[PDB]
Symmetry: D2
Subunit: 305 residues, 4 copies
């Protein structure tokens, strides 16, 4: 137990990553359309898939359904280059550690663990929470900071102190709308993998040292997000910003309403899923926003299966 973990060997999960929607069909999860949807991601240059995130409706899934979609994501990318960074966060520490051990023993390449929501833990509670998770598994741990949906914020000091104190934790996914914090993170701890959780600012984050994205827009346009990320990591910022500017219109209309309501609306209107099913308290969008998503979608080339 030491504080000098930053430059030791860390396994990382970077590149273009996708927060997978969870398709539903007559109350259950469409396990077969789930497999089809990920194969589409594999064939479009995607580097990793994130099952059961916020886009996958982690709140409304049961413990037994959460398990099925981690196993399916692992098995469709077996034999391929694509990695599985499974969502295993929870607002209870015993729940987040219990999910982390499942993902490790079932083939996941890493885990995404969101900051505890609703109960608003303190900075010492956050250290304690993630330290228990990191010492529970031997696979990489990527923090997820989304203060607008959890009520909590992982301090830059906590993120940097966990990076140095834990040997699995190697970075964070920032959904903060705070580019200042992204300069703060990479100017004081440049050995960390800063990941974008906001599609509109995918490129500005990657131009300051970011090493990957966990996209929601990826669900609809995996090829374009794949090109944007790989252009930036190849230090080809002119072409990476060219893609980023052309994606802004769809990057924001996919959040006209709370994620993942608009993105599943796009996939229904693009024929990529049969039915427009959400699980309450999520519901189909307003009739005005339904028309707004379909209008902006006509300006992009949607790849099929």
């Amino acid at each position: 137990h030491h504080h000098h973990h930053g430059s030791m060997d860390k396994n990382i999960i970077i590149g273009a990553m996708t927060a997978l929607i969870t398709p539903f069909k007559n109350g259950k999860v469409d396990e077969q359309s789930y497999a089809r949807l990920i194969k589409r991601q594999i064939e479009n240059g995607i580097d990793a898939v994130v099952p059961v995130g916020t886009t996958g409706e982690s709140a409304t899934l049961t413990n037994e359904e959460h398990r099925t979609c981690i196993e399916i994501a692992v098995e469709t990318c077996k034999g391929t280059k694509v990695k599985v960074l499974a969502g295993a966060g929870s607002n209870a520490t015993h729940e987040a550690v219990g999910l982390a051990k499942f993902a490790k023993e079932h083939g996941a390449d890493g885990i995404l663990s969101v900051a505890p929501y609703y109960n608003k833990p303190t900075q010492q509670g956050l250290y304690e929470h993630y330290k228990a998770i990191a010492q529970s598994v031997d696979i990489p741990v990527l923090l997820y900071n989304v203060p607008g949906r959890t009520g909590c914020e992982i301090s830059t000091d906590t993120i940097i102190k966990l990076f140095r104190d834990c040997e699995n934790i190697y970075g964070v996914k920032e959904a903060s709308g705070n580019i200042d914090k992204c300069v703060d993170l990479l100017a004081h701890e440049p050995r960390m993998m800063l990941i974008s959780g906001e599609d509109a600012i995918n490129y500005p984050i990657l131009s300051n040292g970011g090493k990957g994205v966990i996209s929601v827009t990826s669900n609809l346009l995996p090829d374009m997000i794949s090109a944007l990320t790989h252009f930036a990591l190849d230090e080809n910022y002119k072409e990476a910003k060219k893609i980023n500017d052309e994606l802004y219109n769809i990057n924001k209309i996919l959040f006209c309403e709370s994620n993942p309501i608009p993105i599943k609306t796009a996939m229904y209107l693009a024929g990529l899923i049969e039915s427009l099913e959400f699980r309450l308290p999520l519901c189909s969008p307003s009739k005005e926003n339904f028309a707004k998503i379909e209008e902006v979608m006509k300006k992009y080339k949607i790849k099929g299966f």
Copy 2:
């Protein structure tokens, strides 16, 4: 409509070596009964509902039911969740085991729309035949239940009868009670207990009640008897402890206060909750020296 109002307590959940100490829970509730409390709210956010298991959540509702059997005190069990099928299961859980009503927090983390909140609460209301009190706490859920959403649920379902506002928005409480005066507005913010009940509010769901149940009971009962002079004097006299109980995220400071008053054995939280800094630990006991803490 059947309603549950008055001075109510968001019960802390005492722990002893990692497990729920069921015997101190009953003891702590008996202290609430004997100090003028009108109802108890088991396993809310103050009760650490997030870190409890599904099987521990049930036992603490059953313990509350049996400790108030034969008394005037009602049991308003916490049954909220960010998944509607989970909240409907817990609402049906409380009904079959003797609870008089349920408190249901707005879904957290997933940020439902106004239409999602409507269908979320309607599904809960269609699961039970006992009153349902909404709970709006935007600072911890990321979403807010519109005044119109609250009013439209109040009129469409016969169990939904009010809301427990923890918003710091006195403007919203005039909006609610000027357009729907039959509604029971309950305070979820101890510092503004009097101003809310001062505009037509009919009860509180207190965190301070845990430590000073007699004073919070007096504040509420004075206001509903329209003795606002005496109800406001207690509110002004409680402001110092009402704010130091949130120096850190609830329920970290109040569980510290009850440990320093000998009312619980151990200062255990369940992660990601933890004991406070010793600087805030010293501040809470200093504020406690100015108040009269009722014992057992």
Copy 3:
């Protein structure tokens, strides 16, 4: 110079008070409609008038026009019970002290001085700013806290420490949407006059010890606001809340857009002023909000001249 000023003799300006709109006619100020508009306030039970506030467009008036409307407000209430609490705040201390000395030497009964805007002074700068103003005049000083429009907040400690340290400062006008701060102020310093700057919460503030309001809705319905305030100060809270609940609909539609754009729209549609003139960067409201204000207005009885 001492810290024990709280219980010494303080002159106060309380009751129902009105932030007067400044009518314009072909670029100039309508000095004659200004006099007419205040006489309407006098004849409807109003206790005091606030010339050249935020509702009077203090930002766009010149120094010479600011002067004229303080003199006119003083002279139309000469011989009457109505008091003049002139607006004399500014983001520069030499400007706020210069205006305070004018109001004193020209017949004002007190001054309203807003917290400095734009330059965001610190709490020590705020003490310093108001202490210089208070020691410049011998007439009462009422602070004005509106953090949503200045970028600054007067700490409860600063307001209480200025109340005790200054012999003219006797209270504050809170436009904060923070009822917690109104419990904070009156629970630690009950000898202060807490004034409401938010019409929707006029009664809840008066029920916790508030002693008056500085209303914008007063411009249209002075009689109803006059009844609400005097009912509360006579401890008749049932009838004061009865008025407050019936005023909520107009209390909020008068802020569909930034004050004082909606309130002058109401007075144009009620025939109380000839022309709908603002001074840039203020402008007439959107055509949709113009219809919204007129629709809600039909449910109230508008007293004429």
Copy 4:
């Protein structure tokens, strides 16, 4: 369109016994010229425009004009106001006295609507024939200039050519430059200087430039020559001073820094601005020990 871009400095206004010390102002600007600065912005928010008189505002624009005559450095005079007739008078003020352009802050205190901002800036643009750069700082004005409002002003008036964003909203800077790529996006936030110019920004209006003009000039010129590796290294190396210069409201910390570097005689502000606490006074000098401060 004529544009004013590059590394720019929001000039502090030094005072000496209550009056503007006009001789140190010229001296401080000469230091800016000789350290690679492209333009100077007199009497902004960093220059204490609020507490200056109308006659002092003019002299500090004229001093800036004469100190950069014969040099490559341009003068982008501050001419914003919350009243449009005042801002048009100041815009016409700068034009008749040799300024190359004007910086115009969004109206403060009175919170104009999006239509009000449009007519506010159009009136300023129709008063002068030199470029006009908008200034959006929502944390100090209470209002925000919509991306569409900025784009609609850019296309309708031939002097308006960009905006200086002090918003901490990198999302808005993608919105602006993806829908209007001919626009000159200028940074008004020193900490995010590189990420903004990294997305197509073409200059900065710095507060840190006052103390370290050579480093800020190098950061900007590296980025526009597309050497983002070297431009980002300077940005990461400046973060510590970029944040301690806002421990208190600007320009209180930076005026403290220049006093501790001997570059100004007296640490005078004009009320309601005042010297910082000695705790923050000690913190600013500690951060200064890690940077190389260019002298005269």
